Design a protein around this nucleic acid. Structure first.
Lengths: 100, 63, 133, 378
RNA sequence: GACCGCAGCAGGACUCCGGGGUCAGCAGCCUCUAGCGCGGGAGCGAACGCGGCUCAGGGAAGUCGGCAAGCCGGCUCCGUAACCUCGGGAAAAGGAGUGGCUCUGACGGCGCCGGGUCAGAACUGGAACGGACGCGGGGAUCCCGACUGUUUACUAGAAAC
RNA sequence: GAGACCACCCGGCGCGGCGCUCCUGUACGGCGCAGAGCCCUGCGAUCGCCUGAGGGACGCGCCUGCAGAGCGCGG
């Protein structure tokens, strides 16, 4: 079961100090993916961390498209999240594809 | 009911909104927003500012 | 002054030097105080358009007027004030016209636009002013 | 020594203790006096603050500068979806104080009121009123108990619940409010009137009129823990003060040794239950009428809903009460509105000539969405 | 980075060698090389405090006192007073310009080849241009001490020495 | 809508879309018969058109997507 979802980093770094924005975005992506996959363990590919940190600590990209693959099951169920580049986030919405 | 026009903007001002400035040249200039007001008070040309009905009338878009 | 005034934002506190609209030969009037002001502790007396202010003519003014506390009326103010009709109005410069304690003006002419609140309060200001705005 | 200069104390000590309000919503407390023999009438209603508009009215105050002149004035629209009567409560005048004889509840209680009785309805037992419904449902229990109220009760009130589904609120459960039946020729007439509205909706338009003065009771916006300068209006000290300038410098003399209640101190600055009084009802109309906010000068459809909707509220569908000026509380807050205890005797009659329907979100230069389409053309 | 201060202490402690851009600059601000993330981390975004930012109208009315803040400032070209020990004052005071593009002259350089400054010009642009950075507010006096210097390490930098 | 922590008021939340509206001021790009000039067959700050555009949203309505109410703990 693979989920393709957008997360608005600008909304998740809101209310927090701008210096603590890129690490705060990483923590937010991890929590959001937990409430999408319904898992407890989230691994993020370094590609996600290169995208989030692309514009520096203060400015995070406005939106991230992420591919969550629920690799791991049988009492482990980790989630592997990869960045999927998209020209624009137009009518993009969560797309749960496939089954275990 | 009665409506006025941003003197700089040329966009209509509904009653109760906007400010009026009376100049030493004895002309009241009714301004719809604090934008209309600061554009005028910085000598910004009405034409050159695209949203104003004056620059649209020069480009013929309005007329 | 005639009638009941309506509270309008009082732009000029004491110390406010205001330009002189009348041709009496004063150029800038220094506001010593506001007529009719019972004030709280620490509150500088403040005056709006249509309020009589004791002023002193500055060094630039003709000597005869200078060195006497004299009454005046604020006729224009930079501070935006709301009329009870929702018109927020402001003027390019704060100004005053020197008037006797009775109501008569020391200067024959009032220069530039004059506010309605001053014009209603003082009949002589209304007749003299070319424009009431 | 003497204080050396004359200044008033900062703040009203009547409004102490300045604590968060512990009542669930603003509560009516005193209801207007009975004046027995008046046209039988209900005294109060619960509504939710929807927003503010600004209206242009013709003023007829005689001997005023604004006589025969047009005045733009602020207005507060309170959404008032119809409340439904659910109970009849009678209170005897006892030497202890008003004492409730009994509450005779309705044969059927609606799900919105019933959801108030439980903390989480989905997981709840659903046991409330279970036996009562069986005891009633013949009408004998409701009528025999109602008769007891006629014999002993001196004050009759009616319990009523708001319909939160007709509001853009997220409440789901319905506020229960007691509204006093007043001005009856006799208490039995009050009970008969009270039974006529039982299980039936009551509208703001029935309870109040245009030009009447009402007093709005609500909980104020909260500002959290706040210091003496914001909470009590004390003067900020000179910049050179060490340990800060935002403070009351002297909290008292050596004697009284203890600090006094009168001295200003830091603490909660909001969510206080306050009654505002004597506010004129400018309009009482329903949003289902499309020209409710259109006058003879408007010549456009214009309904109450602003272009872009009510900021921090919703669609104000159904009945609403527009009142002059302001009411305590933020948008969405329940406000109980009551007939004025002491109305201002000399108040100008209401003659609205234009009501702004422009966008409150941002600055709106269009009173209708259709006008926006015409201005922006393509 | 191990010395000395009770210590793996915002304190001291002598040198040597010193790239690029902007710049008059070894200034400020960014960077290559090289080094490298300091008695910890998470939340939350109350009062209040510390370090800043902005403020309508007024403009010292505040205060022992403009303390603090702010104005001012680079460069070019005008223009500049009383007084004076004739050296000063003086950056007195006070004006005007400043960006980007497209050029045009100068100047040594000739087998014409090599400079990056000084002028001048058009055309531009929400009525911008020392656009960050760096970077005097000014004037009228009066009292002392001529001056540059020195001083009470750890409360007096002064008119004292 | 409430808050230092708590408490409060609410509860199948929320997420991220789509409309509406508002903010800002006409996007990148393409094209040109604009452009002071230059020297070579190109360069050129800008300008005009597409374009009240593009971008943004914490406000309002909606769901075309995932979702969302403990077999927790007390009693």
């Amino acid at each position: 079961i693979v989920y393709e979802h957008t997360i608005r980093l600008n909304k998740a770094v809101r209310g927090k100090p701008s210096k603590k924005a890129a690490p705060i975005a990483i923590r937010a992506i991890r929590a959001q993916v937990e409430k999408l996959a319904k898992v407890e363990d989230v691994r993020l590919d370094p590609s996600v961390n290169v995208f989030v940190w692309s514009r520096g600590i203060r400015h995070v990209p406005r939106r991230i498209r992420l591919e969550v693959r629920l690799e791991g099951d049988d009492e482990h169920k980790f989630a592997y999240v990869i960045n999927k580049d998209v020209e624009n986030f137009k009518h993009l919405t969560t797309e749960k594809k496939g089954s275990e | 009911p009665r409506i006025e026009h941003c003197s700089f903007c040329s966009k209509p001002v509904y009653p109760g909104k906007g400010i009026c400035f009376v100049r030493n040249d004895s002309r009241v200039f009714r301004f719809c927003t604090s934008k209309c007001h600061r554009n005028f008070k910085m000598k910004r040309n009405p034409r050159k500012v695209r949203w104003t009905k004056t620059y649209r009338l020069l480009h013929n878009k309005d007329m | 002054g005639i009638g009941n005034k309506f509270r309008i934002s009082c732009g000029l506190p004491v110390g406010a030097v205001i330009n002189c609209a009348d041709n009496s030969g004063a150029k800038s009037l220094n506001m010593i105080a506001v007529k009719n002001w019972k004030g709280h502790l620490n509150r500088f007396p403040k005056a709006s358009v249509g309020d009589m202010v004791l002023i002193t003519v500055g060094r630039d003014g003709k000597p005869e007027l200078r060195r006497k506390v004299t009454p005046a009326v604020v006729v224009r103010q930079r501070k935006v004030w709301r009329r009870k009709d929702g018109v927020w109005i402001y003027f390019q410069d704060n100004a005053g016209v020197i008037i006797n304690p009775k109501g008569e003006l020391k200067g024959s002419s009032i220069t530039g636009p004059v506010a309605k609140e001053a014009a209603d309060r003082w009949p002589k200001i209304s007749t003299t002013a070319e424009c009431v705005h | 020594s003497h204080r050396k200069f004359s200044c008033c104390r900062k703040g009203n000590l009547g409004y102490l203790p300045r604590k968060r309000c512990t009542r669930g919503r603003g509560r009516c407390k005193t209801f207007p006096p009975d004046v027995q023999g008046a046209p039988i009438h209900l005294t109060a209603f619960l509504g939710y603050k929807a927003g503010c508009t600004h209206v242009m009215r013709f003023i007829d105050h005689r001997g005023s500068n604004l006589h025969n002149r047009q005045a733009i004035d602020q207005a507060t629209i309170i959404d008032a979806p119809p409340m439904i009567c659910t109970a009849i409560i009678g209170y005897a005048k006892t030497p202890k104080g008003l004492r409730a004889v009994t509450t005779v509840w309705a044969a059927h209680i609606a799900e919105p009121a019933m959801r108030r009785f439980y903390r989480n309805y989905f997981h709840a037992e659903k046991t409330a009123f279970s036996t009562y419904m069986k005891k009633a449902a013949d009408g004998t229990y409701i009528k025999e108990q109602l008769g007891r109220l006629k014999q002993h009760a001196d004050v009759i009130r009616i319990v009523a619940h708001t319909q939160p589904a007709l509001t853009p609120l997220k409440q789901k459960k319905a506020d229960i409010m007691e509204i006093q039946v007043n001005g009856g020729a006799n208490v039995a007439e009050k009970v008969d009137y009270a039974y006529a509205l039982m299980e039936k909706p009551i509208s703001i338009k029935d309870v109040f009129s245009v030009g009447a003065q009402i007093d709005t009771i609500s909980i104020t916006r909260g500002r959290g823990f706040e210091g003496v300068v914001t909470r009590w209006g004390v003067t900020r000290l000179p910049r050179k003060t060490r340990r800060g300038n935002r403070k009351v410098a002297c909290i008292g003399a050596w004697h009284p040794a203890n600090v006094q209640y009168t001295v200003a101190r830091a603490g909660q600055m909001g969510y206080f239950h306050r009654t505002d009084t004597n506010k004129q009802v400018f309009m009482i109309d329903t949003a289902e009428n499309p020209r409710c906010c259109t006058t003879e000068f408007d010549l456009t459809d214009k309904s109450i809903n602003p272009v872009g909707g009510f900021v921090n509220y919703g669609r104000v569908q159904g009945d609403f009460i527009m009142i002059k000026g302001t009411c305590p509380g933020p948008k969405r807050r329940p406000v109980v509105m009551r007939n004025a205890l002491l109305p201002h005797r000399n108040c100008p009659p209401v003659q609205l000539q234009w009501i702004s329907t422009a966008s409150k979100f941002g600055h709106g230069i269009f009173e209708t969405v259709e006008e926006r389409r015409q201005f922006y053309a393509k």
